[PDB]
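Summary for the steering committee. The consortium agreed at its last meeting that each partner would contribute one worked example illustrating the joint modelling workflow. Our contribution is presented below. We chose a case with several input lines so that the handling of multiple components could be demonstrated. No manual editing was applied between input and output; the record is shown as generated.
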Amino acid sequence: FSELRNFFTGDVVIRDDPFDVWDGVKATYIPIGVHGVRLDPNGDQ
Amino acid sequence: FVGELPVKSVTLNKLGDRNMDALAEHLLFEHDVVNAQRENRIFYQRKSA
Amino acid sequence: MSRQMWLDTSALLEAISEYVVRCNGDTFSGLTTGDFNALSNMFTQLSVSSYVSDPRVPLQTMSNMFVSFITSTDRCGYMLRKTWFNSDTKPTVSDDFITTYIRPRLQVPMSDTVRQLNNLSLQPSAKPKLYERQNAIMKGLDIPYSEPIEPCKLFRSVAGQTGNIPMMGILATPPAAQQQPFFVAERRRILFGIRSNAAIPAGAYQFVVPAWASVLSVTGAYVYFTNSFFGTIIAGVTATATAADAATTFTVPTDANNLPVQTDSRLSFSLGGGNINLELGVAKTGFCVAIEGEFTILANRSQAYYTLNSITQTPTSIDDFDVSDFLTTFLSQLRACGQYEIFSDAMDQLTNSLITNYMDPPAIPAGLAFTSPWFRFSERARTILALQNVDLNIRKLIVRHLWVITSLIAVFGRYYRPN
Amino acid sequence: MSRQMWLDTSALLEAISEYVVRCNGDTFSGLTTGDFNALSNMFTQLSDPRVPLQTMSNMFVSFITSTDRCGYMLRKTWFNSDTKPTVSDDFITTYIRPRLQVPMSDTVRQLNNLSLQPSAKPKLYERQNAIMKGLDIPYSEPIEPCKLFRSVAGQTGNIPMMGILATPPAAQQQPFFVAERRRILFGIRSNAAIPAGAYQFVVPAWASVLSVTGAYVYFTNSFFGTIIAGVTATATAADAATTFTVPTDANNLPVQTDSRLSFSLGGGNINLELGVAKTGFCVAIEGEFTILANRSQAYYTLNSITQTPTSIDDFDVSDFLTTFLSQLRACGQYEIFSDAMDQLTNSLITNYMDPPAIPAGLAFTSPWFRFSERARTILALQNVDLNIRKLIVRHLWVITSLIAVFGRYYRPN
Amino acid sequence: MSRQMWLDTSALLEAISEYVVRCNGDTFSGLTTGDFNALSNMFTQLSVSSAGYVSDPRVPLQTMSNMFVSFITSTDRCGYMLRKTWFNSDTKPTVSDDFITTYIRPRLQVPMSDTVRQLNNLSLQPSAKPKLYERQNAIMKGLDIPYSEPIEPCKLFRSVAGQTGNIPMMGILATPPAAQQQPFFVAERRRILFGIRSNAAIPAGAYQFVVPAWASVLSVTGAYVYFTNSFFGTIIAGVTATATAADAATTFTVPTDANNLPVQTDSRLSFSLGGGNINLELGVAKTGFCVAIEGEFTILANRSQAYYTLNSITQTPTSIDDFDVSDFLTTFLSQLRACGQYEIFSDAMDQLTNSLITNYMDPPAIPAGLAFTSPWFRFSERARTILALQNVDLNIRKLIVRHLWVITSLIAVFGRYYRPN
Amino acid sequence: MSRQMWLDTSALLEAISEYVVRCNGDTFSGLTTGDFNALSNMFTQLSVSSAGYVSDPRVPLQTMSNMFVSFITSTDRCGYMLRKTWFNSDTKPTVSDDFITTYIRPRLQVPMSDTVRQLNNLSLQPSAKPKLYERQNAIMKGLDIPYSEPIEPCKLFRSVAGQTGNIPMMGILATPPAAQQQPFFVAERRRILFGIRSNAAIPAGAYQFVVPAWASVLSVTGAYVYFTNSFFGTIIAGVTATATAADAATTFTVPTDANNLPVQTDSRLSFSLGGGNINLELGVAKTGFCVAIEGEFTILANRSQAYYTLNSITQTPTSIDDFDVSDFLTTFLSQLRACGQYEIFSDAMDQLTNSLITNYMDPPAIPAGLAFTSPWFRFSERARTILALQNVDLNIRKLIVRHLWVITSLIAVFGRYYRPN
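What follows is the complete predicted structure of the assembly.
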């Protein structure tokens, strides 16, 4: 019996508590108000 | 427990036909069974990762 | 308990060792090996009846209790009496160590059967356990037919020549005139021949094989003319020869055909039976025949070596049946915890009380003084066998008995650590 | 039946043995070791367990005894092919059959040649295969050079060459290559000094398959524990380095150094260069000797044999017969067998030469268990084509071993 | 990763080999022997898992070796394990390489394994010829070696103040003497030799021999001590092997035993060369003498470190063995030659050796004067040369040697199954 | 990028050539040839830009050579290819260059390509004059060459302890001898020569010959072995080719064959010189003899590594061939001269070969005594020079020769379609 067991043995590592998977997260950009805009200057010489 | 040492062992009892504990009740003498069954609580157990 | 009961547990402890060796660096995590299983179940025979977790603890406790036992004469007394070496009578003894560890362990009748089937094995162990020797030395049981051994260990003192290694100095001294025949032995070969300052005529010479080599047997051997003994040069012998030389051969009482010398052929023959009949071809000034092969002890003839019947003269030169090679670990532990001295004293004690119970009336014989400690058995056995006082028989029995105890210690003490 | 069919069973018996020696003294009360369990199942797969082993040896002796029974095993054909033969002998019917697992068993066998620490002293099986089917032997297994020795052009023998090495030289002689159990010797003895420079040595046939690891190469004057004359092992802290090279290695291999060397004699030639003249010099290589990959064939095929007659070892058989013999002498059947074997051997030689007749000049100097000799004898008949001799050796060998293996438990009552 | 991870895996591979040899010709039709079962299961743990069923063990083993060589030959990949810190710490390195994620990883059981190990050092009959594993542990972590494991003293030999060689001394012990010379202490495969040789006689009396550093850890059992005139088979000149039937008993004594040890007797001795100097009392004058201790040699319990830590090394240059790596490389070499890479490999190794040497000396540059006189697989020699560098501090050379050895050993283990084609 | 990426593309360009050769004069009106189909498709694979049918394959092939020359000249660009690692590891370099991007990338189908390749070594009739791709692989990765590909012995030659060279040993073989000299081993295009020259007759009997390191790789089939007195057409003096129908047979044996091989006989033989030595037996004494082996020469299996790795080299300086690169350059050169750049190229090359050697020696500087006696395309000679630098040790030298070669070839292939205008 001993070896029958040794054949049938394997590993499974498992987190004790299930991961909490967030699905409906809504992350969208929002513009800030009016503001001073600087137009980056073109590469000069 | 396995001796004085407490352990968390896999419950073979709920694994259908992979119930190594029951598979061992097939041996001849009650003692050979017990031994195997206890050896089962030693090898088929939950340990730290 | 009984002598068998100690041997059994010894064999077990000896087995536990074997398997521990077997398991070193073969114990992986997602894998249980059949070997480790056996080891585990063996550790269960020493625990008080029955899983472990740390085998060091129980084994340690076991050795510790053992040292405490073999040390005090009051306890291990019974193991010293003349009877314990013969009788298989359950001893009238009440002692923790004895009841907690010594008990019958081997399976009967099976084990006995297996053992025999072993003698007839193709490749038996080259370096056998102490168990095998214990049985030989104590019950005079048989040794495997194919187990090799170094001849020199087999050596004992005989009428003609007194020692084996001693002859080394003599053999390296030029001769006065044609001297007598010599039968020396090394680790891997056995030598014989005759040395002279003058030439020796071509012809038939007879050599009687010593009572100790009349049990040897070789295979895969090269027999040739040589001039060295243990790396030391022999004088009064020539190795020189010409391609034209007439063939030299020799015959053994058990093989009607001739056995060639100085030939690339591998010989097989026993020395048991009688005398070697060397037919020297060319006449030469001193010759040394060398037999270098694999040596064995003839079937059912190992009784000589292990029972001490190959011993005829007093004093004699003897080996220790190798115990020395097993005491190593135990000693190393003894020195580790500064018990080496105390143990020695306790042993000298053991040894004395032992010697005692063998001679009536009950008193240490006169003239008895050891030149070496308990663990240089070769020497102590020498001294015990060199007592003009006691009959040869009672001397032998003592050496044997002393051996078994020594062996036991070498086996049980290994895990000693008091602290 | 099949030759494979025999080897397969031989292996199973050598296995019975192995596990028996394993189970010795390791047979306890409430404990069933894995070894014993295997051993047990092997006993079953064959037929108290001593009785059966006995019955089997008996019937074997009975078989290999009568030329009428085992005649087929003696035909030039049984050793040449894996063709199942037509034979009905209730021995073969009961004991010889396939027992190894294919293909697995073979796969393992090869994985083994690459193993780090193979068996130091292998089973007959491995030898049988090499000799019969021409298989490979483990790359890391060690052998004693002197066994590998066969006669070559320059010198007749190895051991005999001792008495000549013991005789002072007349004048600067010819190079010599000789071998011991644990080392190789080569050099040039002379009674007159020899200049320092470069010296070509041609590695003999037999020795061109060797390879050493963990070796010390130094100047000596001994051979098998005997003094070599005409050679000087002298030097001084001033002397210039004495190196040597082999084709297999691009760098110099130093001599008389505490350094452990590992080189190979497969290049075919050693290039040695002395730094200081010597009145005769003998270089020695002492280390671990293994047989180069794919060249172990030479040895076990007897294809390393060139001259006639020649020197020949017994492929270690002698060492396995010990058990059987000792069991023969205890029955008195030692003589009977000794003879029955003398016939078995004749008949086999017979079936190898057409027309079917015991050839001219066949007197055996030694009995059947001194193979190393009887082999010399058969390799000595010049009236019979060469190759056919070799085969008779190889073939005779296999039957010998089979005996060494199956008779052991013989107790004729 | 961890130096530890590599060992645990190396051990597994050595175990696989063991069980292969165990199963050779023991694989019968109707039974699953325990050995085979174990071999089967070991194969199973070698691969990933996502390596599926093993129909032919040759393949996964073959694949593994192939990946190993294409790894061990690329500095860019196996670089990480060449830096100083890989040898001296159990720090999980942040390195991504699919060879390691696949094969190298903690395999041994803890703490049970470590325990079984300790128990073995106290075992009766250890393996006569042990696995690289043990050596690896010793040379790297400086762990202990079994108390009864035998060894050939001549390996242990290292250079000392007086004689700077064990083998070289041979050519001199064979040259007749000019006058009474200094004592000598040499070693063979199976025996230790010491004595004094002179052209004139040497009076009877007490003579002191200073047991050399390297030999002060030797122990012998089942030994025969006698007078002899050969050293490795070469004849020793300037010594007498003569004695009279009634000569004055010649004895010696070591600081560990209060009783005298006889010479030229059929008695099997047991003693240890540790503790001090051998005080030898010569019974009858002799014209040069040589004592021989021939028996079973073992390294004194708990002092194997001296040997493997490369501490027994006092002077420079020095003699040094290879801890037997050569005996294990055999196969891998054969496999290399058999597919034509023995050269391309030999190049990549010099590269590995050089880069290793490098990371040991600040600032990062191959030290000048460094020129090898041998190929990567002749360790014994390369070690000598590494140790001979006057530029670098001794203790650093010592480390380099130890390090190179571990890598070299690792090769001998993993490469065995290499077959690219 | 990757060294592999370059080889792969070379093989493509080298293949495009092959098919261009195949299609020449086989391009008809209504036919569709598997060859032209292949070609036209390959023309496509060059340019990452576009994939339309090439109406004029000259254009893109040119643009490619031009782009290449403009790349291979500027050390700022092609520098990365001159690093020690580029010839070693398959690690894709972080380099951004217009050429490498547009033309270099993996192109060989995997794994099929290798499979075919190995299956090829076993093929019956391999190409008698191999593409560069094959050498590139042997010289760089150490791959096997076809088991039955022929080769001219003399190329294989290298310098040995005994005799310095091969071609030069000629003049000496011409001069009558002072007295019985030492054995010689020279090699022609189609035959190997060995023997012993003497002014005085030398006895009939056995004579041992040590086959050289460079020739122990050879093996011949379909061979006639006889006594001659010519070497490359030049007369050898101190040797006789005389004989008579009565003379006893003159046989020679090799370790690989247990049978006597006849000399001066009409039978065609096959034997292996990898045995390590030849054993000749003169049946009748001759006043100086010279044996010749004329047949088909092949390099033994798994041994071509010695030739292509420069491992057959043991002395210094040494005679070294060029692996035939010279024969492939022809085209490129004639195309350079065409536009007057033969000059300007040689200067960019000298900067390349220099800057290359530099990276090979730590610390980073030109060696002392770098006297280039010949131009970049006479490789055979430039190699001798690199291999003659006493400063740098053998290995680094060899590595430079190999690395140089690969670059050299790479040019011989890519340049050809070069036309600046």
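Residues 30-43 of chain B form the longest helix (14 residues). DSSP finds two helices and two strands in chain B.
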